Design a protein around this nucleic acid. Structure first.
Length: 108
DNA sequence: GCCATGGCTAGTA
DNA sequence: CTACTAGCCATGG
């Protein structure tokens, strides 16, 4: 398959995530048949228009924190967002916004 | 072909 | 817990 089929399946995946639940970069890689594309799971997310109806904010790193998303602090945005779905998040000695994965993970 | 970038991740230690 | 490899693999130059 090819990179736009790929980008579509991933957005059908993500779209599936129940409000107020979450999933992992890596899991979706797996779910769409692409067990080793976790990194490109990241970039599909990275490219969305900021219009999108796709819940990119329900996607996190497989330790259950929010990805440092380097280029600058902006992914404040992801947390402020997941808290809008009553998800609970706390913090690390050292930044790492973070959560209870087993509680919020979407296990379908 | 190269390289340097990255919303990644099991392993290690 | 935190760091650190080692793999992974598309992009854009």
């Amino acid at each position: 398959m090819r990179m736009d089929e790929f980008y579509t399946k991933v957005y059908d995946a993500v779209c599936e995530i129940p409000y107020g639940k979450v999933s992992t970069y890596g899991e979706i890689a797996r779910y769409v048949g692409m067990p080793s594309y976790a990194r490109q799971v990241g970039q599909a997310m990275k490219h969305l228009h900021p219009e999108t109806h796709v819940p990119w904010h329900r996607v996190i790193n497989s330790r259950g924190t929010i990805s440092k998303r380097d280029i600058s602090a902006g992914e404040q945005r992801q947390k402020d967002r997941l808290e809008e779905e009553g998800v609970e998040i706390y913090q690390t000695s050292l930044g790492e916004y973070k959560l209870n994965l087993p509680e919020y993970m979407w296990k379908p």
